[PDB]
Design a protein around this ligand. Structure first.
Ligand code: AGS
Ligand code: AGS
Ligand code: AGS
Ligand code: MG
Ligand code: MG
Ligand code: MG
Lengths: 494, 435, 438, 118
DNA sequence: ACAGATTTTATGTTTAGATCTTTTATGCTTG
DNA sequence: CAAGCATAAAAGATCTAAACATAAAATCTGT
């Protein structure tokens, strides 16, 4: 036997065939009815999803408690009639319906900022169009959702499509050629229309610039009956990635999504709480279980001004629906925490919310902690920050050699020999209190404090072997450090 | 807890702390520990003494110096842990895992978990110490490797019968401070004093020096049949003290270098021993005084085979490097003053090939023409460069022909000087301006 | 005596935190944070509600300990309703994270009652199909340590999947990301930030010295009947923590002002409480705290002045000469020949002032130079010590540095310790103190 | 660099030993540690540095120090051959003093050349 | 036509070669 | 002449593409 120059024993290769669909049938006239075959399309193999479903199921439960705000928290999540995206819904639905009843291939490229309903509205369009197809108004079709960012490698998205339209398992190259031959040579008589939702096209293109070209070119063929719904963040992704000539020779409907305004977000929140706002609940003081219409009737409502101010605050910065939903849910959670803090209901006469709770949640989301992180640091940390600020003010280079920091600290701690803190901090800071410890060149906690600041993302030190001349910058803005040092009680004295 | 503290020579506190931390009870033993200290500070020695004084607790000894990268380190960790567990409990029925199956830290986590679950029939909680002796001495070291081993203990099962505790060993005290905020208990090992190192050398070397065959041969040859082991111990201790007092200022406090010097100088010292000398401590010092003044640690027992033309090319290259071009014409008119900063102490300057050839022609003596540059001159220059004597100013893939490459001499003053006297060409003449 | 041995073992076990759960000592300043984390994890496991959270704080800020305490407390009663999957951002890379998640899923599923087989893409699709998709659902509680490595600059493939998974999937999911950076939200890209629950709870900090002394009292006061000495020892400690002038309180003040890290004080106390051989020794050592001073001296005994006091005479002379040359130079750089020239001028001046000092030769000062640069007193001209990660270290290993090829004499160095500090350290009685300044 | 020196040396050792003697082992110095157990024979490795002047002496010195660690086995003996071209002055100048001290215990200056002796 | 021989997809592992960026060794230049 | 001022080139961080390398599944070849 040979002697291996290096061994990889963790290799695991999937059982995927290599022969593309071109050589499978040996004749274009020999292609059978691909619509009705045992394995093609969604005609088999639904057992796997049922195999893993029972894996996480348990057989034990013990009197779960659903409080008054549990219903609100469960109905306000992002898991679940969209009113604010009706125009784009209608446009994309009209495009898809025209392409599906005319037996033609098209591409709809929709782009927008994260969390504005783009994926939700396209999924709603596909669901409604599938429901219409169930009424036998258009030829039947299969929906294949190919999420770009839910894949280990970008070239995976080919084989998935094949595995979802052909039941076979092929490698990415064989999948490419098989899909091209199926979209180019198979006659329209023996094919079923395919709708592909290339979610998060941004992650698919990267360095390859192959996925997007293949998917926007497969819709050009007349034989192919494909309706590619690509969705992305940047509106100019195609024209940049493919080039003006290609994006012109491919005619695809472009849609842009704008972030919701405050009125739209308020409407979304109100619609998601139509069944719970101003409702009567039966609650038992023994455990706190709430039942929707010792038992007490409690009225639950969410203040309109709180929703309005939350929507105004969240829409003015991003307009993302998910952030508004999450901040409202956090306000409800704060109210519920106060509820069991006052009552003590545990687990296993009008209750409402207030603008104070929403404001608390918004402040938690927005306000940073660096100004609060400095003010609770050790004395040596604030001394180090003070010396850094002093040297930055003196030199103006917004970066300082570390040995120069040490020298400034020593000078600062020796000039103020009469300050009421310094004469007793100097001993514990240079000799660590006890004798028998010689005068230390650096502070006692110098390495500890330097690493504490570097780890906390609050100070950047370039990598150098010479600890004397390595330079450190303040990642945080200089105003924060000055405010933090002003908040101290003894640093401002000296 | 109930562990025995061994008796070491000058590491009382270090061994007290080491016994305080290391213990056979995994509940009261830190999951990480660092014996930090420089070379010769005696940390492997005291650690080995501790682990030989408490055989009831088990350890695995590793040397990351031999395991250059991190992947061999992981593979060796897995293999040695498996082998030690098999040796300790041969009665447990266990399947083997190939040590070469681990290639990432996650695979090491999985392999350690799989080895530890199959040893679940142990009666009592057992801690296994994995001594990464020399972790900082890794040749593929980087800042983001130690903390992998720091946080490794979190990924292993909490309730497993066998718990692996790490005992690292680094020697830099600037690599350690990078992780100073991890607050992992550590035992810093200070260096050794002159008296301490002398005592250690006496303790660790008098037996070997007394039991030298050379000394026995010298005694039986010189016929001194009145001696005791006390006399030999005294003479060995006197030699150790003499060598320490004579070379401590030169060697510092490194025990290894002092051991090398002792091994080097003992044969001559014992060869200079005669009848009345041995019974007089000052006789050896006054008679073998040569050994104890000048150190001898170089290969030359106590130049270039280049051609004449290559030697002159080297001399011309050095002259070009260490002379200002604007002074070349004035100095070499062979057919405000000079600087006294002694540029021979600074890095050699960069010159051009044409200047080198011109000054080489200027300095070459007339034979039989001025030795017009021919194939031999250029071949000798290229051979000098491939000997790394005339280094260029560009990285690999060098092209000597581009008019953007410059040459600089790559020998110090000593080599070029003694080459100059080798060919009997004056070199402290053109540098007489700079003395 | 066995009583003191049992008390010592119990006390040191209390110090190390390995004390059994339901009686673990919890400090009074992180009780609020513990209640918050308990609220989150119980609201997620008991009520099967999925949500995410990122813990932030310095190293050894009691976040892994707090989460482990919560899991241990909640596992002794409700063990069949949740499976714990823990990833560490240091050892688990981007590719290996999927393998680790699959392995831990299959292991916990086997324990409570395949996935990991196949290629990595098959593994990822399998775990996604499994988990993303009267009785309840076994909640999968994720625990990310150092989530800032998974945060990444560009890809963020795993975080997006897991946050969309906690936002949209059916099985209840927790994900606790224990990271260090304060600006953790700036690391996550726009989509992952939108998916993230936008909830971060910051680790509490020691705001008052009273908090630290109360924490130390809670940590070091054994509160159970194990040994006959427990009745005595406790009150002793109380006395030592009642008088402000007491030595242990002074050391607590020192730690509060310098480190403000309780684990450092605990690592100091452990050898103090393990060295004592009887109860009298333990009492007198906790009264005197001499071993704390010994420990502090040992910790600092090797950094830069413990190093400096181990230099021999010639080594100190060469160090001083090199410092002189560095200070005289404009950029602080020097080399072997300049340092030796200054050293020989210094020794000649001293001898002319005159017992006789042997001016060591070049070939005998070369060894001192190598030892001095080996003790990290000098550094190369522009040399980076340790690279940030493995790729950069590999790139550097393949490259050939210029300073390596330059001969030994002409290698240009730089100084760790300036001449002024060298004067500040060296005692006045030393015979080189005259040349320690220009 | 040092790691590739070691990997090449261990690969050559394994290949030659297996060819003489007619599972796998990772390429590291522990192959020398396990050699007596693996092949039931003593070892004698002879390192021939072809052009010792061209190698940057930092990595050569590190490799020699690494090889020094292989003397705790009492069944392996090592022999080094340095194909020096210029003289020992450059070797003394470049190599660390500790490495020269370690080499000095057994060295043999052998003058082999076509131009020597006439 | 069944096991061996070759291929196809899928990495890991070193060597040779590239451009960016930072610093600093060169010139330009009055007396 | 040096300082100022400018461009220039050395030293190295950071990276990629190619040569060299192994390996498991599926295809292609002869009895
Ligand atoms: N028109 C709408 N009516 C009601 N709720 C909405 C509406 N649009 C968005 N939402 C809510 O906000 C969420 C947005 O989810 P998606 O639309 O999938 O996010 P997205 O816009 O695709 O962002 P990505 O995936 O980051 S590009 C929905 O799941 C709902 O919870
Ligand atoms: N306390 C001691 N008592 C006796 N001998 C000692 C002592 N300390 C060191 N030695 C001697 O030192 C030598 C061993 O040195 P090591 O302990 O290996 O040094 P080291 O610092 O561990 O080496 P590194 O760091 O691994 S290069 C032997 O000669 C020991 O006898
Ligand atoms: N398994 C454990 N059981 C009890 N206490 C522990 C355990 N592991 C660590 N600790 C203690 O936790 C404290 C250190 O804080 P940890 O939470 O462990 O680290 P951390 O705060 O998570 O820091 P990281 O991991 O670097 S972000 C010390 O008191 C440790 O002794
Ligand atoms: Mg989406
Ligand atoms: Mg050792
Ligand atoms: Mg952790």
């Amino acid at each position: 036997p040979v002697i291996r120059k290096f061994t990889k024993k963790n290799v695991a290769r999937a059982k995927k065939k290599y022969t593309p669909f071109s050589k499978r049938f040996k004749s274009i006239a020999a292609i059978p009815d691909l619509t009705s075959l045992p394995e093609f399309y969604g005609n088999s193999s639904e057992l796997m999803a049922s195999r893993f479903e029972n894996k996480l199921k348990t057989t034990q439960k013990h009197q779960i408690v659903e409080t008054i705000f549990s219903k609100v928290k469960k109905q306000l999540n992002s898991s679940y009639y969209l009113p604010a995206r009706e125009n784009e819904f209608a446009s994309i639905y009209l495009s898809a319906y025209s392409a599906i009843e005319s037996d033609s291939a098209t591409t709809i490229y929709v782009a927008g900022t994260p969390g504005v309903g783009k994926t939700l509205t396209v999924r709603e369009v596909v669901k409604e169009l599938l429901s219409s197809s169930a009424q036998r108004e258009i030829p039947d079709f299969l929906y294949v959702e190919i999420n770009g960012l839910k894949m280990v490698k970008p070239t995976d998205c080919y084989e998935t499509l094949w595995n979802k339209v052909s039941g076979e398992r092929l490698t990415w190259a064989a999948s490419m050629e098989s899909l091209e031959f199926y979209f180019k040579r198979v006659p329209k008589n023996k094919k079923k229309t395919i709708v592909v939702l290339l979610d998060e096209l941004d992650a698919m293109v990267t360095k390859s610039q192959d996925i997007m070209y293949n998917f926007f070119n497969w819709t050009t063929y007349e034989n192919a009956k494909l309706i590619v719904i690509a969705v992305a963040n940047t509106m100019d992704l195609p024209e940049r990635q493919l080039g003006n000539k290609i994006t012109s020779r491919i005619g695809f409907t472009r849609i842009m999504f704008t972030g919701y305004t405050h009125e739209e977000l308020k409407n979304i929140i109100d619609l998601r709480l139509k069944g719970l706002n101003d409702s009567f609940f039966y609650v038992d003081t023994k455990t706190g279980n709430a039942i929707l219409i010792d038992v007490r009737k409690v009225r639950l409502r969410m203040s309109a001004d709180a929703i309005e101010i939350a929507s105004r605050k969240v829409a003015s910065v991003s307009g993302d629906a998910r952030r508004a939903l999450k901040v409202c849910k956090r306000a409800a959670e704060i109210a519920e925490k106060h509820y069991m803090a006052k009552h003590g209901y545990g687990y296993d006469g009008v209750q409402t919310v207030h603008i104070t709770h929403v404001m608390k949640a918004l402040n938690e989301t927005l306000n940073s902690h660096v100004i609060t992180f400095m003010t609770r640091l050790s004395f040596t940390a604030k001394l180090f920050i003070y010396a850094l600020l002093n040297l930055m003010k003196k030199n103006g280079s917004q970066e300082q050699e570390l040995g120069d920091i040490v020298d400034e600290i020593k000078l600062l701690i020796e000039v103020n020999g009469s300050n009421k803190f310094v004469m007793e901090i100097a001993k514990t800071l240079f000799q660590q209190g006890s004798d028998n410890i010689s005068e230390q060149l650096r502070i006692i906690s110098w390495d500890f404090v330097l690493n504490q600041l570097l780890d906390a993302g609050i100070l950047f030190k370039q990598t150098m072997k010479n600890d004397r001349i390595c330079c450190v910058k303040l990642n945080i803005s200089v105003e924060e450090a000055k405010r933090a040092m002003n908040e101290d009680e003894t640093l401002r004295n000296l | 807890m109930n562990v025995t503290t061994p008796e070491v020579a000058f590491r009382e506190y270090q061994t007290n702390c080491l016994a305080s931390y290391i213990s056979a009870d995994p509940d009261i033993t830190p999951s990480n520990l660092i014996l930090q200290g420089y070379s010769g500070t005696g940390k492997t020695y005291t650690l080995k003494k501790y682990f030989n004084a408490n055989p009831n607790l088990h350890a695995v000894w590793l040397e990351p110096v031999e395991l250059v990268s991190w992947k061999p380190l992981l593979q060796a960790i897995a293999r040695t842990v498996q082998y030690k567990l098999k040796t300790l409990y041969p009665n447990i029925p266990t399947t083997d895992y190939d040590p070469l199956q681990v290639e990432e830290p996650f695979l090491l986590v999985k392999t350690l978990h799989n080895i530890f679950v199959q040893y679940e029939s142990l009666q009592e909680k057992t801690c296994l110490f994995l001594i990464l002796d020399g972790f900082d001495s890794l040749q593929d070291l980087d800042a983001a490797l130690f903390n992998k081993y720091i946080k490794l203990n979190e990924l292993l099962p909490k309730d497993s019968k066998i718990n692996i505790k790490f005992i690292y060993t680094m020697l830099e005290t600037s690599f350690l401070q990078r992780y100073s905020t991890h607050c992992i208990p550590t035992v810093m090992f200070p260096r050794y004093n002159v008296d301490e190192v002398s005592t250690i050398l006496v303790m660790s070397r008098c037996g070997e020096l007394m039991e030298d065959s050379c000394l026995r041969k010298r005694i039986i040859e010189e016929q001194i049949t009145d001696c005791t082991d006390d006399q030999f111990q005294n003479v060995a201790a006197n030699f150790i003290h003499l060598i320490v007092q004579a070379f401590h200022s030169y060697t510092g406090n490194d025990i290894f270098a002092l051991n090398d010097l002792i091994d080097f100088k003992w044969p001559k010292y014992v060869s200079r021993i005669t009848k009345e000398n041995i019974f007089e401590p000052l006789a050896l010092y006054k008679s073998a005084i040569k050994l104890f003044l000048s150190t001898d640690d170089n290969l030359s027992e106590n130049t270039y085979d280049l051609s004449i033309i290559s030697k002159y090319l080297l001399i011309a290259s050095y002259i070009c490097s260490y002379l200002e071009p604007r002074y070349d014409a004035s100095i070499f008119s062979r057919k405000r003053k000079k600087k006294e900063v002694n540029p021979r102490y600074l890095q050699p300057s960069l010159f051009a090939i044409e200047r080198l050839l011109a000054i080489f022609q200027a300095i070459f003596p007339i034979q039989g023409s001025l030795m017009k540059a021919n194939i031999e001159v250029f071949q000798n220059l290229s051979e000098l460069h491939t000997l790394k004597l005339i280094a260029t100013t560009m990285n690999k893939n060098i092209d000597y022909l581009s008019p953007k490459v410059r040459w600089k001499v790559n020998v110090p003053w000593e080599i070029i000087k003694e080459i100059s006297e080798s060919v009997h060409f004056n070199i402290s003449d053109y540098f007489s301006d700079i003395h | 005596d066995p009583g003191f041995g049992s008390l010592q073992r119990r006390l040191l076990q209390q110090l190390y935190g390995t004390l059994p759960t339901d009686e673990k000592i919890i400090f009074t300043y992180l009780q609020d944070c513990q209640q918050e984390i308990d609220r989150i994890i119980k609201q997620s496991i008991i009520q099967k509600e999925s949500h995410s959270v990122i813990l932030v704080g310095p190293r050894q800020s009691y976040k892994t300990y707090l989460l482990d305490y919560e899991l241990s407390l909640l596992q002794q009663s409700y063990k069949e309703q949740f499976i714990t999957i823990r990833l560490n951002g240091f050892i688990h890379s981007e590719q290996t994270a999927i393998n680790g998640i699959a392995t831990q899923l299959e292991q916990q599923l086997q324990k409570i009652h395949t996935i990991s087989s196949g290629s990595l893409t098959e593994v990822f699709e399998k775990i996604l199909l499994l988990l993303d998709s009267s009785i309840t659902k076994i909640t999968v509680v994720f625990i990310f340590d150092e989530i800032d490595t998974f945060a990444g600059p560009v890809r963020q493939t795993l975080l997006y999947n897991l946050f969309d998974m906690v936002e949209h999937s059916r099985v209840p999911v927790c994900i606790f990301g224990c990271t260090t950076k304060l600006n953790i939200l700036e690391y996550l890209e726009k989509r992952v930030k939108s998916r993230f629950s936008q909830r971060v709870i910051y680790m509490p900090q020691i705001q008052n010295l009273d908090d630290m002394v109360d924490a130390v009292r809670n940590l070091l006061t054994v509160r159970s009947e194990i040994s006959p000495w427990v009745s005595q020892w406790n009150e002793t400690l109380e006395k030592e923590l009642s008088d402000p002038r007491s030595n242990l309180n002074r050391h607590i003040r020192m730690n509060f002002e310098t480190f403000r890290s309780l684990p450092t004080l605990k690592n100091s106390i452990i050898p103090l409480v393990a060295t004592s051989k009887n109860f009298g020794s333990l009492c007198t050592a906790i009264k005197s705290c001499s071993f704390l001073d010994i420990y502090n001296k040992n910790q600092l005994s090797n950094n830069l002045t413990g190093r400096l006091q181990s230099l021999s005479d010639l080594e100190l002379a060469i160090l001083i000469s090199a410092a002189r040359v560095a200070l005289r130079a404009k950029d602080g750089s020097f080399n072997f020949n300049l340092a030796y020239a200054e050293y020989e001028k210094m020794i000649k001046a001293i001898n002319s002032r005159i017992n006789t000092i042997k001016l060591w030769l070049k070939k005998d000062v070369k060894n001192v130079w190598e030892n001095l640069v080996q003790l990290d007193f000098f550094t190369e001209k522009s040399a980076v010590g340790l690279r940030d990660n493995a790729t950069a270290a590999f790139y550097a290993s393949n490259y050939q540095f210029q300073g390596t090829m330059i001969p030994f004499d002409l290698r240009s160095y730089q100084m760790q310790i300036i001449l002024q500090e060298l004067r500040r350290i060296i005692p006045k009685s030393n015979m080189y103190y005259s040349w320690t300044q220009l | 660099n040092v790691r590739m020196m070691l990997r090449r040396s261990m690969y050559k050792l394994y290949s030659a030993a297996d060819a003489e003697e007619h599972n796998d082992v990772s390429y590291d110095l522990s192959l020398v540690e396990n050699f007596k157990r693996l092949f039931g024979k003593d070892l004698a490795m002879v390192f021939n540095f072809k052009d010792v002047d061209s190698i940057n002496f930092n990595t050569l010195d590190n490799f020699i120090i690494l090889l020094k660690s292989a003397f705790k086995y009492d069944h392996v003996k090592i022999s080094l051959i340095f194909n020096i071209n210029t003289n020992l002055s450059n070797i003394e100048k470049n190599l660390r003093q500790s490495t020269i001290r370690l080499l000095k215990r057994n060295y043999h200056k052998l003058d082999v050349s076509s131009n020597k002796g006439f």
